[PDB]
Amino acid sequence: QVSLGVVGIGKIARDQHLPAIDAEPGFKLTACASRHAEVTGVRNYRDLRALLAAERELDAVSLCAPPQVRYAQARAALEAGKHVMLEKPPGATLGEVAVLEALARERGLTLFATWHSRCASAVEPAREWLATRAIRAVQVRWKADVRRWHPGQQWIWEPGGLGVFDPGINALSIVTRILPRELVLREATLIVPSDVQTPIAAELDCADTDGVPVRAEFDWRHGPVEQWEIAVDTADGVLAISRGGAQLSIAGEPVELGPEREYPALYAHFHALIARGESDVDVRPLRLVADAFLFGRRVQTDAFGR
Amino acid sequence: QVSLGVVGIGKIARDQHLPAIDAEPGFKLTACASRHAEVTGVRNYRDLRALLAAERELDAVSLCAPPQVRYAQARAALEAGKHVMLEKPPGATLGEVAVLEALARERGLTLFATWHSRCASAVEPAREWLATRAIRAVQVRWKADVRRQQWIWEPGGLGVFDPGINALSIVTRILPRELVLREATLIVPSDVQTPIAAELDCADTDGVPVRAEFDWRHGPVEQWEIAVDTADGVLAISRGGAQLSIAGEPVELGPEREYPALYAHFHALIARGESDVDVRPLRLVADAFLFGRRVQTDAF
Ligand SMILES: NC(=O)c1ccc[n+]([C@@H]2O[C@H](COP(=O)([O-])OP(=O)(O)OC[C@H]3O[C@@H](n4cnc5c(N)ncnc54)[C@H](OP(=O)(O)O)[C@@H]3O)[C@@H](O)[C@H]2O)c1
Ligand SMILES: O[C@@H]1[C@@H](O)[C@@H](O)CO[C@H]1O
Incomplete structure (x- = not known):
């Protein structure tokens, strides 16, 4: 298997990501990071930094937080040596996606813009x-x-x-x-x-x-x-x-x-x-x-009306 | 040496491009395209399509028009098999530049965004x-x-x-x-x-x-x-x-x-x-x- 962490447990993480991960045999959901949410059955962290510090055997991370925080989370994950899967859009800018791709390729890690x-x-x-x-x-x-579709x-x-x-x-x-x-x-x-x-x-x-x-x-x-x-x-x-x-x-x-x-x-x-x-x-x-x-x-x- | 054409003869073509070209023997200024200007001493066309059709020994072209019209000129030059030099910025959109880059790479041609x-x-x-x-x-x-x-x-x-x-x-x-x-x-x-x-x-x-x-x-x-x-x-x-x-x-x-x-x-x-x-x-x-x-x- 491949050990997997999921970051930002909100709308799409619950509706789509977690059900898909459970049914995929190649992945073992290991940890989740979220400031206001908990996933029963796995280790839970309030932020990605603490997850990465404690989960040293973890292999990969999937990000489902808003795109404004996507670069910082993805950089931190790749710096720790984790493969990274990105919700769309892959970034708030084009430069940050090119930087992440160069970083992943130098470390031999997988970056996936979904x-x-x-x-x-x-x-x-x-x-x-x-x-x-x-x-x-x-x-x-x-x-x-x-x-x-996006209330509040x-x-x-x-x-x-x-x-x-x-x-x-x-x-x-x-x-x-x-x-x-x-x-x-x-x-x-x-x-x-x-x-x-x-x-x-x-x-x-x-x-x-x-x-x-x-x-x-x-x-x-x-x-x-x-x-x-x-x-x-x-x-x-x-x-x-x-x-x-x-x-x-x-x-x-x-x-x-x-x-x-x-x-x-x-x-x-x-x-x-x-x-x-x-x-x-x-x-x-x-x-x-x-x-x-x-x-x-x-x-x-x-x-x-906001 | 490299035969060269210049498209869009405005002030900085007059002030910077042509003097720079005339001072480097590596290039032979062969033709110039432009609608409202002619360059003494070389063949002159009013647009790049006419220039590209007539100058078949031409090796390269440098494009000095604004970027909004430069993409179509750069595409036509690359399809003609010519090396292309671009004024800045290399395009009005990043999609335009990516298309030119893949087109130049496809034909083994030199593309230079200056x-x-x-x-x-x-x-x-x-x-x-x-x-x-x-x-x-x-x-x-x-x-x-x-x-x-x-x-x-x-x-x-x-x-x-x-x-x-x-x-x-x-x-x-x-x-x-x-x-x-x-x-x-x-x-x-x-x-x-x-x-x-x-x-x-x-x-x-x-x-x-x-x-x-x-x-x-x-x-x-x-x-x-x-x-x-x-x-x-x-x-x-x-x-x-x-x-x-x-x-x-x-x-x-x-x-x-x-x-x-x-x-x-x-x-x-x-x-x-x-x-x-x-x-x-x-x-x-x-x-x-x-x-x-x-x-x-x-x-x-
Ligand atoms: N909803 C859809 O229809 C859909 C479908 C496919 C893809 N997507 C994409 O998937 C991404 C997430 O969409 P979403 O609908 O799930 O929005 P969301 O619910 O508001 O965001 C999901 C979670 O990200 C965390 N969050 C919010 N601000 C954060 C911040 N500064 N730092 C860290 N975490 C923060 C929150 O978790 P905590 O508060 O617990 O930390 C939130 O529960 C988006 O890029 C979206 O475009 C959405
Ligand atoms: O974020 C979009 C959401 O707005 C919905 O309209 C359909 O697909 C999601 O990816």
Whole structure:
């Protein structure tokens, strides 16, 4: 087995990480660090520093805290000689991810920047179908009510919190995996409530290296049903990914998919990378979000209920 | 020797690029493309596509247009099989630069993202002195007046980072370790889309703090200074990289020859079959736009 610690036991750690870890036989959950939470059955620490000081035989760490603290935790873990798995986004900046990757590679440790939506069941079938087809246009719609999905959450509205790009980067992680050629931003518009530092809605217009337009709309003002869809117009008809990757239709006919197992897949891949002594750090989804903040127009909107 | 074309004949093409080229025999200036200017003594085209179609013995091209149009020109030149030299910054977005870099590497072609400030005379001596020494802190002071031009105030125009990135290209060159942004503040006037002033709080991979202030407002000081405090005293760079003090003792520097040095390195890159694409100064600015708190001030 491989000994594993989990840091920051909040929403996603309880809903997805811990169940996935238990079912993965290659990992033995050994310790957990969290300031306000405890995981029964394992040793518990209030912060990562104390966990790392006491858990010297521990092999790997998985971080599920907000991204603003991701660099410090990941650096501390790699400095102690642990393999590191990162929730998305892999960092608050691009420089800190490059620094962590160089650090991991010099120590021969595994760094894994995860993108859970890439493991949605529709992603690989869509990728295989699109590899050898003339793509004409790409449309992305990613809208959901923030108050139903992140109630009371505050770090999403602070610098480094991405705002609507926090789930929006899930769509971009899928888009950059299913399209055969790289993206480049042409324009962006970020809509920012006057009481927060991150956008609540955004519009991205990119093109692949052959000029295929890629239009994307993100919004956190929405009704109670999500719209998480990606539509790829092809000379053979439209490929339509919906429900965040759990539903796929090709040329108007539905495609049967295996059940959604995003986080088991992630942890199976984390284990494989450790065994191979390899890293997996793809920053292209965050690089595009950075280009949107760097190049995009910023428009103000009325305040949000925080 | 290497046949060369120049695209975008503006003032600094006239003032810096062409004199630098005419003074190094390693290059043969063969053609120039530009819509509103012609260069005596060589063939002239109004755009790069016409130049690339006509000049088929051409080896390389140096691009001097603004970065917003440079990406399409750089792509076309690389598909044509030409070595490419870029003015700074190497792109409007980091995605643009990554695409060019993969395209140049795919064709075995030389791609050179230049930072003319890195060729200032103080830069290499400062870097050689700091490589071995225990650095404690770094401060960057950049202040000037903007009223003594509209693309700078528009989405992707960078604002005060348009000149400010030159200081960042020297900082990232002389320091022995990479920088991570920990905090940034961008002060944007309410009638524009880019910062007039900004501060960057960074740390290197050893925790050394690196602070950088940029300001374009009216004020008492016209300032460009980089101060690196070490266990052996303060290394100080002033006058845009033309002046160097080590431990309070001034250091004698040669004359400014930024663009001759750039073109000499381009030729050496082509001879070695190498490229030189350092995007870290732009990656830092993008991190500031991504991670920085934004603050409003009165209209410009
Ligand atoms: N929720 C989702 O839908 C979802 C899905 C997939 C991925 N993700 C990603 O996974 C990450 C975590 O998301 P989340 O929904 O779980 O948010 P969260 O619940 O607010 O954060 C999880 C835990 O991180 C700890 N935390 C907060 N501030 C901290 C700080 N300065 N230092 C150390 N720990 C701190 C907290 O644990 P303690 O107070 O006990 O220390 C918190 O319970 C995010 O990057 C998110 O984007 C989220
Ligand atoms: O963080 C996002 C969350 O906002 C939700 O909308 C869907 O996927 C998660 O990764």
